[PDB]
Design a protein around this ligand. Structure first.
Ligand SMILES: [Fe+3]
Ligand SMILES: [Fe+3]
Lengths: 403, 403
């Protein structure tokens, strides 16, 4: 009711259904389970069995199925539960009765809904060339697949000039308004990723560098994804970021995120361990979270990763990416005009806001470490039949039952 | 003096020198350091700066230099120490006075000495076709680069038949002689990696699966690597394994490791978290370790990963890979002939042994968890100016000063 940053998720044509369950290895168990699936008309390359990462005598099952297996899924869950004997969690993309809202278990699974994106006013609406250029970048995202190197695009001088206009202003403002963490990493991005005022950095280059710092990686997205999907990606330390640039007509404005917003507002901080851990915690807390809490986390995300203020000693600087890529509001947030409140997730989670520039209120975080722990705690209050944790080694979410 | 499994490391033509040091970010520090390198004739793409993963106000430096920069390195270390102010560790591949034995800091660095490998008696010596086939596999290893998918090779029926001979025997013996962990993972390798008696699995397939389980990954090696380099790889959960198969003339024998030995003896257990962690601990304890302790760890490795016996309750099974891929000694080790001693690294580290089949003595491990902690402790006694820890996210060793 005030145009928020919370985008409710859809469902494709087939949607997505995944069954989470572990099976203790007892002679024939593995075969009975696969036989169970085999029997009910299900391709067994959609069922994956792996050793349990928690219990040395169990197998964990991953099922890449969709809505087309719905009819015989009830039977299978029943059998698994009653006959075979296994605690089963049904993850559904259409989050219905008794089903936990779907979420990727493996980083690769981020491919599933990555292409689930959402003009008249938009600068560039009457620009054929721009519209085509946007098609090009959208194509790259749509065609993108996890693991692949992000395709490089040669930016035109015009675009580079737009970049520079935004770059120049912000750089000449980070020292006095940006948090230590941002100002700490930026010089390196300039030195190593081609972050210059006469050059738009290639997403592949930035992704490599990010990984090298925090394991974070980039994924080119065509447009805005549902909060569930964007937040979810953070659990795998994956950042869905645009590659296109705003229209040159108004370099100082974007009614949507763009390469300028991702590279100068988000990327720098994702290179910091504490910050990386913080944002990932928000992603992990969203995994399978009910719509209500996704919006809450989306709101929380908004007042932290996007428009957050960090308290450094006796002063307050900005770390919110929405601030660090918007000179105007970047100066405004540190002025004496905005209302400031300490970060307190229960109140922040229900905070009323609008997407319009120049937020009237900002939340101040003690540190990234404090907020991370702050989110960990808020997460514990989110209705979920289990808890989650990321495994950097296998790049797979490990679902542990509530602690 | 009894032909051991300890292979002392060499040095290429240029060798390898890396400087470990962190720099607190104080105006101009970063530039002074790079200027410092720039000045002394050093390509700055050989110097890498990244945010410290431990201290939020420091930069960590990675230097991919060799022996050709030796002359001006003394000056640079002096400057860094006295002028700039930084604790500097000089890693040298030629481990000389005051230099810590070199070791990869980034997983990619495993490329540096990966191709540093070491016939008359060998079965296949007079076989032109075999020798050429071996050239082919060696080529693939030499050309291999971390990150790349391991090239697939179509094995001849003859080779597949050799595989089957070994496979058949072992499979029909794992139930009664192999540890739970091995028997737990094997069925999955059969179900998912093409581990059949009529099919030699492709290393790429196995690597993917391994990663999916423990993050472990394979790297095709041409022949035997120095203990330092092989053990070191384990720190990154990377297994250097052969791809070629023994000569068909004598399927029941190999005077060297081969695909049969890697896939059936090592791979299964590397899919277990506890085991993966254990072997990695040995790799982490080798990082920069003096030659003496590398041989010790090599010896330890020998009596554990290669020829170790695990105590399961009241019984004892085998987990040593040398045992699990050698039917003959696999039955022998559990007979009443071999001498058995509990795992105790200080005595095991100095244990006398020979490579000849049918070990007279084996060391029994409480569990993989106990041995891992056992190695962690033994490691603390290894002369090193710092301690190490692996970062799965960035795939980079983080060097913390002694704890
Ligand atoms: Fe954003
Ligand atoms: Fe071996």
């Amino acid at each position: 009711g005030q145009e928020t940053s919370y985008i409710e998720d859809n469902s494709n044509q087939n949607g997505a259904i995944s069954l989470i369950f572990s099976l203790k290895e007892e002679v024939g168990a593995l075969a009975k389970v696969l036989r169970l699936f085999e029997e009910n008309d299900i391709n067994l390359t959609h069922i994956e069995s792996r050793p349990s990462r928690l219990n040395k005598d169990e197998y964990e099952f991953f099922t890449y199925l969709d809505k087309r297996t719905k009819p015989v899924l009830g039977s299978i869950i029943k059998s698994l539960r009653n006959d075979i004997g296994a605690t089963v969690h049904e993850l559904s993309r259409d989050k219905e009765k008794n089903t936990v809202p779907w979420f990727p278990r493996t980083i690769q699974e981020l491919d599933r809904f990555a292409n689930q994106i959402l003009d008249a006013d938009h600068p560039g609406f009457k620009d054929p060339v721009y519209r085509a250029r946007r098609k090009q970048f959208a194509d790259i995202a749509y065609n993108y697949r996890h693991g692949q190197p992000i395709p490089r695009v040669e930016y035109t001088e015009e675009e580079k000039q737009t970049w520079g206009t935004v770059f120049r202003t912000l750089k000449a403002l980070y020292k006095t308004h940006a948090c230590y963490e941002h100002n700490h990493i930026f010089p390196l991005l300039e030195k190593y990723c081609g972050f210059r005022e006469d050059n738009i950095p290639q997403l592949e280059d930035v992704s490599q560098f990010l990984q090298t710092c925090t394991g974070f990686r980039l994924r080119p997205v065509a447009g805005l994804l549902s909060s569930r999907d964007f937040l979810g990606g953070l659990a795998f330390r994956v950042f869905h970021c645009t590659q296109y640039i705003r229209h040159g007509s108004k370099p100082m404005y974007t009614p949507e995120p763009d390469i300028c917003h991702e590279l100068l507002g988000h990327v720098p901080l994702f290179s910091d361990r504490s910050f990386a851990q913080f944002s990932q915690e928000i992603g992990l807390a969203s995994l399978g979270a009910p719509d209500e809490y996704i919006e809450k986390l989306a709101t929380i995300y908004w007042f932290t990763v996007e428009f957050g203020l960090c308290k450094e000693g006796d002063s307050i600087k900005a770390y919110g990416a929405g601030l660090l890529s918007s000179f105007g509001e970047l100066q405004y947030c540190l002025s004496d005009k905005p209302k400031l409140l300490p970060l307190e997730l229960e109140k922040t989670a229900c905070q009323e806001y609008s997407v319009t520039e120049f937020q009237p209120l900002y939340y101040v975080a003690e540190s990234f470490s404090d907020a991370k722990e702050k989110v960990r705690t808020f997460a514990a209050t989110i209705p979920r039949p289990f808890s989650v944790r990321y495994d950097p080694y296998t790049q797979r979410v490990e679902v542990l039952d509530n602690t």
